[PDB]
Every structure is written in structure tokens, then in C-alpha cells.
Amino acid sequence: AVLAALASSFYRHPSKNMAVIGVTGTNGKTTTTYLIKSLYEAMGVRTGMFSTVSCYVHGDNKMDSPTTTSPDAVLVQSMMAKMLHNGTEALVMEASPQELASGKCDEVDFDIAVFTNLTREDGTDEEYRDAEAKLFARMVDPERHRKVVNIDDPNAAFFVQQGNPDVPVVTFAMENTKADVHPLKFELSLFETQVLVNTPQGILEISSGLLGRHNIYNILAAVAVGIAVGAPLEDIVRGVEEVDAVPGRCELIDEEQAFGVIVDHANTPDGLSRLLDSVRELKPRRIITVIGCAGENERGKRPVMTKIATEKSDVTMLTSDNPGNEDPLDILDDMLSGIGWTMQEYLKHGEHDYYPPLSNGHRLFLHDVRRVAVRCAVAMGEEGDMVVVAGKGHESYQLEGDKKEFYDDREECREALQYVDELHQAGIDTSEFPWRLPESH
Amino acid sequence: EVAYATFENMEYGEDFMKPDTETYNWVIQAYTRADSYDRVQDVAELLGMMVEDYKRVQPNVKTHALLVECFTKYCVVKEAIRHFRALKNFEGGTKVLHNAGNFEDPLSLYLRALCREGRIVELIDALDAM
Amino acid sequence: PEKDGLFCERIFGPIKDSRIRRYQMGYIKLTCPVTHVWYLKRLPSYIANLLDKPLKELEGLVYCDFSFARPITKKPTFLRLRGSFEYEIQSWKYSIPLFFTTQGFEIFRNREISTGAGAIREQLADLDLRIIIENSLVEWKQLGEEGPTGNEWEDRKIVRRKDFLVRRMELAKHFIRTNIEPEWMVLCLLPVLPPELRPIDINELYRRVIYRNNTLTDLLTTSRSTPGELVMCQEKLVQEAVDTLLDNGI
């Protein structure tokens, strides 16, 4: 049943030898993990990483273990021996609520516990709370290992009680200035975020590529973890500053242009809605969204995505995310049902070379072909605008029919920004969807 | 053409073989329920024979049911209305035209054709018959 | 008889039962579609009537290496281009393909700009035959609404246009009541007469289209062939070869 004793015997309790850091929460798990890993890299400590986006076993080199939900519990401890075999010193991984509930992490000797936030928007209500508490229930040692909590979440008091009450705790929050680390002054910009944080050791200043306050939690957690391990203030700056682009998690790709490009993994109505209003606070001129939906799966969310995008964003670009065996145009037709439009009606406006604006005055431009859509949206951005892509994140494959064609949005935005100037220097007016070439009309 | 060939064999024949009201209904029905090229011209000519043979043949409920079915299907509505008005004079009326909703029910088409053509005044008259 | 030839035993049955050679026939796989000249150059042109475009535009699209805009309407398009362009677009050859990459550009290339008989075939497929009847009827109704114009020449042309519209909708009404697709006027496969019916004149025509078409494959299967001046050269000729094969007097 439980077994896994040999998993801790063949590995000889590999987790105990190394330092394992656990990060748990509904939002901001992946972003915090990279900040912590780069923070442990900055201290000269070898870092092990097992997030969802990647499985860095050490430093920068990657690997390709089966990332099929939660790996087998005996299999989970296997590579923990492998990273320890190469000599990995520090370990960090997203403490997925289902992973520890299923017992995958049973013999894992966690050292630092971090609670980003609990929203439960991902089932049970209080059982889900104590399900995450098992991560802090692992915390038996009261003098050596450490705890990190976020006061702004009302459940932090519940979480801190879990495990040994005598464990030292480092507390971070935007509000509750009584916290150990709190932002004295923060500024939001379309290309960077600058925050001044009051650590117990002293005032610290950071300026990273993470955009929006939704990742300030991760930045506050990262410096707080450094205080928990007693990292020097200067070295914490290097670790936070080093990370500038987490793949697929509100990633900003900036090829030295006048308007940033954001690549995000949001595909759910809640994730997209949370993202779009999280970029309005950045004070952009306009918001351009590229959103798709998977084929033959969760078809009940397609009208919702269009309704959210068309309201939050000034310009929306419906596209095919993973058509699969379903017709890409059919998926877009379900999207247009959210606004009352139909694919037939949209194409009728295409004949007239004029797509009417929505009721609120926003623009809706759909194109089935994904590659020509993300690149087209990039050319549609003026100075101060913001272009965000969604539905793919880090997944570098476009599922057409049954073949998984290699498609990466980061390369698309990277190349589109490279050649957008040549398009404008050729007289192409890429402001609205019906491009006006020099020979037109 | 199979039904029309039989009609010709009896139309241009002896007196006892001359077509009656029932005969004209079958020939029209064959052309109306055709899965092939346009037959509206043939129905009109076939109807032309019946009106010319007025001294012997008089239309019945089934006759106007098919003509309304034919004309509504071929989008000619003004002639469909004329036969529907004569169809209303029979007690069976729209039920014969309904055909239990079979053959892509023509009774609905007549209502739908009037709505799209905007002939609402005739539409309320049709509802009275129903 | 050479293998896969105009007299190949495998294609047309045994040479010496042997009677099947009179009946069994082969086909030709054309890389590019070819318009059937019976419906293109035999005035009045059925393709011209159906597409409403004047015959001069169609002639230049398949013989004068022109280009046509918005061939397909059933799919989204992002361009201000309208119709037939007698001049090649400067930005279409080095700017747009570079921006969208060659691999991605050719995915929607035919959706925006198409050339040769491929433009006609896709345009014929895209035709909404129901819509063609509706707008032609109202246009025909509109022309007679004005009535006389007081000028013989103007009244001469108003009759031609009205008869053109009636002929157009009559053509459309026949298509949807039968199982004949208008795309078939532009064939992508060429049937071959059985060898017995063409003993050793038309054989040299068949060998003319075959070798012309085969060398067109060599201009496409090769890695990054030169497009345009070479692709068109043996694409108009293959049109001519099929042209003279079917009808030579027109």
C-alpha cells in the first residue's frame, strides 16, 4: 500500500541529506520557486527544482522526466537520489495540494515551508485548508527548520498553528506593517516593478521583470525566505534581480521595444479574468489579448472566455489554441456565442474590410491560424499598449488533429518584434485587422 | 417521369381512361416530392391541363395541398396564397397540408414563407384556418 | 510498352483479356489545377457568368500571370486587397513572407492571394450559390426599375447586363438542384483515352502534357526552387497543353 520504504532505502533517505524547501498555495507557486532557486543559486548553494514548468536538477541544466501530473511516490524519490548523486544541495518544489494529500511526498525531509496564499478557486472548503496544512504538519523540528507564511491571507494563523508551534516563522505581507518584510514603496511599470522592502536586517530595494502586484507576494516571499535562512541582503538582491522571465507565468518578453509582450498560461475564465485586471493596474494605454480554447474538451467555457476578454481588454484576438480533431473555426464560433456574434456574421464584415467595434467600443479580431495571429497582435501594439497571449504559456506544441506540431509563443513574439519595424517601413498599416497595404482599397 | 408516362397513357386515351381528380393529384404529388431537378414548370403545365379540363375534373383538398406545397417549396408565394385560400374552404384544411409533419412539413413552410416575405396579413389568415 | 507510359500494360490491361484495353483508362495527376477550356474560352464563358467577372480578368488570371485578392471568403482574412491585380505586390514577396516566416506564410498564402486556375477553383468552391441567386435577382430588379435612359448605347448595355444576370441565376439554380459541383469546371485530374482509341495523333498531345507536367513537379519537389518566373513558366504551358488537348479551335 504505502510502501516507499525502499524508495527511501535505495535512495538512503536522499531528501534528508539535502535541503528541501516546500512552497504551497493556490497562486504564485511557480514564480516563487524560481525566485527561491535563483536565490539559492546566488548563495553558491547547488539547487534542485521540481516545479510544473521545469525540473531543473542543478543550476541551469534541464531534464525530461515524465511530467504526468504527480509522479509515482516511489518514482518521485528516485530522482531525488539522482540529484543528490550529482551532489545537489538545495531542493525546492511546488507543494501541490494533491501531491502531498495522495502521499507522494511521504519520506521527503522538508526544511523551509512557504505558504503563498489560499483562495480555493482551484471541492472541499475546510478539508482543503487542512490538506495544505499537512505540509506544515510535516514540520516537527522546532529549532532547525523554518516556516514562512503570508499574513494577508486570513488562513495564515491557521497554517502557522500547524506542526510544531516553536518553529521560527518569517512573516511577509503588503499590508500589516507589523510583518517582518513589508513594501515601503512600490511602483508598477509596463516593463519592470520596483519595490522597497523593509527587512528586519534593513531596508532592501529590488527591481525585477515580474509585472503586477500578484507576483509581489513571490518577491516578498523570496526575500523573506532569505531572511529565514539568514541570507545576506546584498546576495538576496542578486537572486531576485537575476530572475526576469518565468516561462508561461506572466512572462514578459522584451526585445527593446516600446510596448511589452506578456506570455501567460491562463486558459480558465478565472485565470484570464484575474490576469487581465492584474495588468490594468500596470497603467497601460491599451490591452491586446490572444486567447484560444482546446478542442473537444471543456467546451462549456468558450463563451465565457470571450465575454471576459472583450470587457477587460480593448482589443481581443480569438485564436485556435489546441483544435485537435475539432474544427478550428467551430471553436471560434463557440467563442463568438459569448458576444452574440457568429462566424458567418464576422466573415460578412470581412467582405466590407471593416469589423465594427463592440458595444463598449472595444475591438474583436479573430483569426484561426495561430502563428499568423500572435504575430499579427504584436504588430497591432502602439506605444504604451500591452499585448498578452494566453492558453499556451510554456507548452511548446500546437495540437492539430493528432499531430503535436512544435509551436512556441515565445519564439513567435520574439520574431514578430524583430520584423515589425520592417512591416511599418514598407507602408503596411497594422493598426486594425484589415491591414492597409500601399496598394489597397 | 414514371408517373407522368402513365398519366399520358390515360390522358390521351379513351373516355373511360380519362383522368379524374384523383389522377391529377398523384401526378402533381410525384413532381412535388421529387429529389431531382426543378419541376415547378411541369407542375404548372400539369395544373394547366386540369383547369382546361374543368368540365370533367374539379379540384379537391389534396389538390390544393400539393399546389401550396409545391409553390411554397419553389418560393413562388403569390400563387401559393391563392390555392391556400381555396384550401381554407375545406373542413380538413391545414391538416391535409400538414401530412403529419412528414415530407419536410409544407404547412410550416407556408407560414414561414409568409413571414419572410412580409405578407403578415395573409399570415394571420392562415392562423385562422389552423 | 514502357512502364507507367501511355501504353503501359499495367495501367490499361493486358496487351494480348486484351479487349479491356478499349475500355480501361488512366488519369494524370496535375500538380496545379487546370481550367476546362469548354467553360472558360468558349464564349459565353460559364465561369465568367458564374463568377460575374468579365472574361478579360479570367484570361489574365490564368495566362497573364495575374493575381487575385480574397479568393476565399469562408475563412478569415486580414488584408485590404480587393480583386484581380495585374501588378505583383511589392510587399507581398519580401516583407509579408519574412514577417510570418515562409512555413507559416504558405499556410494562409492561398487564402489572401492566389494565382492561376487555383484562384478560379477556390473562388468557385467559395461561391454561395444561394447568395448568387438573391443578389442577382435584386440587381436585375433594380436595373429595370429605372427604365429607359434615352440613349441607345446605354439601353444597349442595360439589356446585356440584365440577360447576364438572368443567365447567371439560371446557372446557379441548376447547380444546387443537381449533384454537379462548379469546382469540377477546373479539373485537377486529367483522364486519358484508352490506348486502342488512340493508336500510333492525340498521343503526342498526351505525351506533351505529361512531360510538361512532370517537369513542373521537378520545379516544386526540389528544395526551395525559384518561384514566379520559373514556376509560372511551366504552369501556363501545362494550361496550354491541356487546352489544345481538349479544344484547339477556340
Side-chain angles (χ1 to χ4, degrees), chain A residues 1 4-5 7 14 19-441, chain B, chain C:
Chain A
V20 181
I21 289 84
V23 285
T24 180
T26 310
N27 295 10
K29 279 195 300 298
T30 305
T31 304
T32 308
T33 307
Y34 272 21
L35 295 178
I36 265 64
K37 180 187 180 61
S38 180
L39 180 276
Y40 278 90
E41 274 164 318
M43 296 195 297
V45 181
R46 298 183 56 173
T47 70
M49 213 284 303
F50 193 67
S51 73
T52 171
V53 63
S54 59
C55 294
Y56 296 177
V57 301
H58 176 246
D60 207 321
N61 54 260
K62 309 177 49 59
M63 69 98 45
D64 47 358
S65 58
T67 55
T68 61
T69 69
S70 63
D72 171 71
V74 180
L75 188 276
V76 156
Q77 305 184 26
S78 61
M79 65 224 88
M80 308 192 80
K82 179 59 63 180
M83 292 177 39
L84 185 64
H85 163 58
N86 193 267
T88 306
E89 303 176 353
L91 197 283
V92 58
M93 61 93 50
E94 313 174 357
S96 304
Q98 297 80 6
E99 182 165 351
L100 81 160
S102 55
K104 299 299 186 177
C105 300
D106 52 357
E107 288 132 342
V108 183
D109 181 70
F110 297 90
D111 304 73
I112 284 82
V114 180
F115 165 74
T116 67
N117 45 13
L118 204 287
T119 69
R120 213 197 68 89
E121 260 66 47
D122 179 72
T124 67
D125 176 73
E126 61 281 350
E127 177 181 351
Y128 189 81
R129 293 167 58 258
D130 55 66
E132 313 276 23
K134 308 191 308 302
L135 190 269
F136 296 86
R138 164 89 68 174
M139 196 57 266
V140 184
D141 186 298
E143 80 285 344
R144 299 182 302 103
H145 308 165
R146 307 301 173 85
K147 289 174 175 296
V148 178
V149 299
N150 165 39
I151 315 98
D152 289 332
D153 196 313
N155 307 268
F158 167 76
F159 276 96
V160 68
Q161 296 172 8
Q162 318 305 318
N164 210 321
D166 310 70
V167 181
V169 177
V170 179
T171 64
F172 69 98
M174 296 97 173
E175 295 79 357
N176 308 120
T177 57
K178 53 185 178 180
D180 306 326
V181 180
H182 43 276
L184 303 181
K185 163 189 174 183
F186 72 101
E187 296 185 359
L188 302 180
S189 177
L190 294 182
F191 303 92
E192 85 292 343
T193 304
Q194 304 177 2
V195 183
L196 281 73
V197 295
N198 175 22
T199 74
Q201 284 70 6
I203 314 300
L204 205 60
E205 209 291 326
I206 55 96
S207 60
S208 180
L210 280 308
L211 306 180
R213 65 172 62 259
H214 63 161
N215 52 68
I216 297 305
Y217 277 120
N218 312 129
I219 303 182
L220 288 174
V223 55
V225 167
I227 305 304
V229 301
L233 305 183
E234 307 83 5
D235 206 1
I236 296 180
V237 177
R238 300 177 179 179
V240 178
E241 181 182 355
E242 204 286 318
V243 157
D244 294 322
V246 47
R249 318 296 162 169
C250 197
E251 175 183 3
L252 166 63
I253 167 173
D254 181 14
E255 291 305 310
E256 206 70 21
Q257 77 286 346
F259 60 102
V261 188
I262 306 301
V263 177
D264 196 77
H265 76 281
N267 47 20
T268 61
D270 306 71
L272 182 65
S273 181
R274 189 195 65 86
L275 177 69
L276 292 189
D277 78 312
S278 175
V279 85
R280 182 73 66 173
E281 63 181 5
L282 276 305
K283 298 300 183 58
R285 201 65 50 82
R286 295 187 308 172
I287 292 87
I288 330 289
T289 59
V290 191
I291 175 63
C293 282
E296 296 176 340
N297 294 85
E298 55 274 354
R299 317 194 312 178
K301 78 181 184 179
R302 296 169 178 173
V304 192
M305 229 63 52
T306 318
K307 176 182 179 60
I308 297 176
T310 49
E311 294 173 1
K312 304 295 183 301
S313 178
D314 304 326
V315 179
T316 59
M317 276 273 312
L318 308 186
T319 323
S320 59
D321 197 10
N322 287 321
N325 305 273
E326 194 176 1
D327 195 310
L329 295 185
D330 294 0
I331 306 177
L332 298 177
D333 196 3
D334 292 1
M335 283 188 182
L336 298 179
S337 180
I339 329 293
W341 289 19
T342 52
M343 174 65 68
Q344 175 186 0
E345 182 185 13
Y346 179 84
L347 297 181
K348 293 304 175 60
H349 297 293
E351 300 180 357
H352 307 345
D353 301 329
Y354 164 76
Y355 305 101
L358 307 173
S359 301
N360 51 18
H362 292 193
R363 306 307 300 271
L364 170 57
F365 302 142
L366 68 97
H367 201 299
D368 46 321
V369 186
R370 180 84 179 193
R371 180 181 320 277
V372 320
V374 46
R375 298 174 179 264
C376 184
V378 169
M380 219 167 306
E382 68 191 8
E383 177 181 1
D385 283 5
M386 183 54 58
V387 283
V388 300
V389 318
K392 276 289 180 290
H394 69 279
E395 294 185 358
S396 60
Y397 75 99
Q398 171 70 95
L399 179 57
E400 304 174 2
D402 299 329
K403 183 64 180 302
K404 290 189 175 182
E405 186 270 353
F406 168 78
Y407 162 81
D408 196 332
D409 302 61
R410 281 81 57 83
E411 273 61 26
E412 299 291 339
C413 304
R414 197 105 57 185
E415 296 180 359
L417 291 167
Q418 179 179 351
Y419 303 99
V420 57
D421 56 332
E422 300 186 10
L423 206 54
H424 288 277
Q425 85 188 4
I428 317 300
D429 182 15
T430 66
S431 60
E432 45 194 353
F433 208 46
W435 291 2
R436 295 189 177 184
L437 314 187
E439 297 78 10
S440 291
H441 301 41
Chain B
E1 293 79 357
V2 176
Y4 187 70
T6 305
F7 175 76
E8 283 196 341
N9 168 234
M10 65 187 297
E11 157 66 17
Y12 313 97
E14 273 61 29
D15 55 335
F16 56 90
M17 291 166 35
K18 281 300 181 300
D20 57 355
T21 297
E22 177 187 5
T23 295
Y24 281 98
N25 303 143
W26 295 118
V27 187
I28 293 181
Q29 174 180 349
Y31 279 95
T32 60
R33 317 189 190 282
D35 51 82
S36 299
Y37 326 94
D38 173 286
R39 309 305 175 106
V40 64
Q41 302 189 1
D42 309 5
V43 180
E45 181 184 15
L46 204 22
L47 178 59
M49 298 175 177
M50 169 149 45
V51 49
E52 287 180 0
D53 195 7
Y54 63 98
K55 306 179 185 302
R56 281 188 51 258
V57 178
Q58 295 289 348
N60 61 330
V61 197
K62 187 178 181 296
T63 304
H64 296 87
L66 303 173
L67 297 177
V68 169
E69 167 178 359
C70 182
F71 288 153
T72 47
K73 279 179 181 178
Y74 284 103
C75 301
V76 39
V77 185
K78 271 166 288 178
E79 274 65 25
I81 298 179
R82 304 225 314 268
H83 297 291
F84 190 90
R85 293 171 182 167
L87 182 62
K88 294 154 52 261
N89 299 119
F90 297 108
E91 52 90 9
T94 62
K95 276 183 170 57
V96 179
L97 178 55
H98 185 54
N99 288 323
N102 203 79
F103 306 109
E104 206 281 311
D105 165 280
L107 178 52
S108 304
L109 301 177
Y110 178 72
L111 305 184
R112 206 62 190 89
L114 294 179
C115 167
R116 305 216 60 170
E117 286 286 351
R119 312 179 186 275
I120 299 306
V121 184
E122 288 75 8
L123 180 54
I124 76 176
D125 301 326
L127 301 181
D128 302 335
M130 317 179 87
Chain C
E2 304 291 340
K3 236 296 183 178
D4 300 355
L6 288 176
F7 292 86
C8 174
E9 179 270 351
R10 178 256 180 177
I11 303 179
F12 308 101
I15 172 63
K16 203 65 177 182
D17 61 330
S18 56
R19 193 183 303 177
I20 197 57
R21 297 184 62 86
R22 288 191 171 186
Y23 310 137
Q24 188 176 6
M25 60 168 58
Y27 78 106
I28 305 170
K29 193 269 182 181
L30 300 88
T31 52
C32 63
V34 161
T35 52
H36 195 335
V37 303
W38 276 19
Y39 306 106
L40 180 59
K41 301 213 298 182
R42 297 192 69 94
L43 199 153
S45 178
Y46 294 92
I47 294 181
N49 297 330
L50 200 58
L51 294 182
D52 188 76
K53 304 307 176 60
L55 181 55
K56 305 302 179 180
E57 300 177 357
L58 282 314
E59 294 288 337
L61 190 45
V62 291
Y63 302 117
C64 299
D65 59 80
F66 287 168
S67 298
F68 188 73
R70 298 289 185 83
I72 306 178
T73 320
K74 270 68 180 301
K75 292 184 174 58
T77 55
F78 61 113
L79 275 186
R80 201 72 179 189
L81 310 186
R82 179 56 60 183
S84 175
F85 283 7
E86 65 282 353
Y87 54 94
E88 190 267 354
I89 294 300
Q90 71 294 346
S91 61
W92 185 262
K93 51 168 171 289
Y94 44 60
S95 183
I96 294 295
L98 181 57
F99 182 84
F100 291 103
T101 68
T102 300
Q103 312 304 316
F105 172 68
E106 54 88 11
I107 301 299
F108 75 104
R109 155 186 273 274
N110 299 22
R111 194 176 307 185
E112 312 293 338
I113 284 298
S114 299
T115 176
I120 289 90
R121 176 171 180 83
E122 299 301 326
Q123 193 167 357
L124 288 173
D126 190 281
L127 284 177
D128 193 329
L129 298 177
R130 269 86 176 186
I131 265 60
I132 300 307
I133 305 176
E134 302 298 332
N135 52 18
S136 297
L137 178 56
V138 299
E139 182 183 352
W140 182 93
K141 185 62 178 179
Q142 177 179 353
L143 297 185
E145 176 266 0
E146 297 88 28
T149 61
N151 172 267
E152 176 182 356
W153 169 257
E154 298 302 326
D155 296 330
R156 186 68 52 84
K157 282 300 160 294
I158 203 62
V159 174
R160 297 174 177 267
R161 184 60 180 181
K162 286 176 61 179
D163 295 2
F164 176 85
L165 297 180
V166 176
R167 177 169 63 258
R168 182 185 192 191
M169 58 178 303
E170 178 184 1
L171 190 60
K173 291 173 70 65
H174 278 53
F175 272 111
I176 76 181
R177 300 301 294 109
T178 189
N179 56 329
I180 301 298
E181 299 290 341
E183 301 85 323
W184 304 351
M185 286 183 294
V186 184
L187 31 77
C188 52
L189 299 184
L190 181 57
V192 186
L193 201 65
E196 299 294 336
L197 288 78
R198 44 172 185 81
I200 60 180
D201 185 15
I202 54 185
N203 294 321
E204 64 183 339
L205 287 178
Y206 270 114
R207 87 170 64 259
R208 184 147 297 180
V209 56
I210 286 285
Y211 93 99
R212 210 164 297 268
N213 184 26
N214 292 336
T215 37
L216 180 52
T217 73
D218 311 332
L219 298 187
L220 270 304
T221 56
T222 180
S223 60
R224 194 58 196 90
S225 59
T226 299
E229 67 290 338
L230 266 315
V231 170
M232 189 277 315
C233 184
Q234 212 161 205
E235 195 277 341
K236 169 188 174 182
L237 291 181
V238 83
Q239 178 73 20
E240 295 182 356
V242 183
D243 185 356
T244 178
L245 177 58
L246 305 182
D247 197 338
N248 194 22
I250 58 175

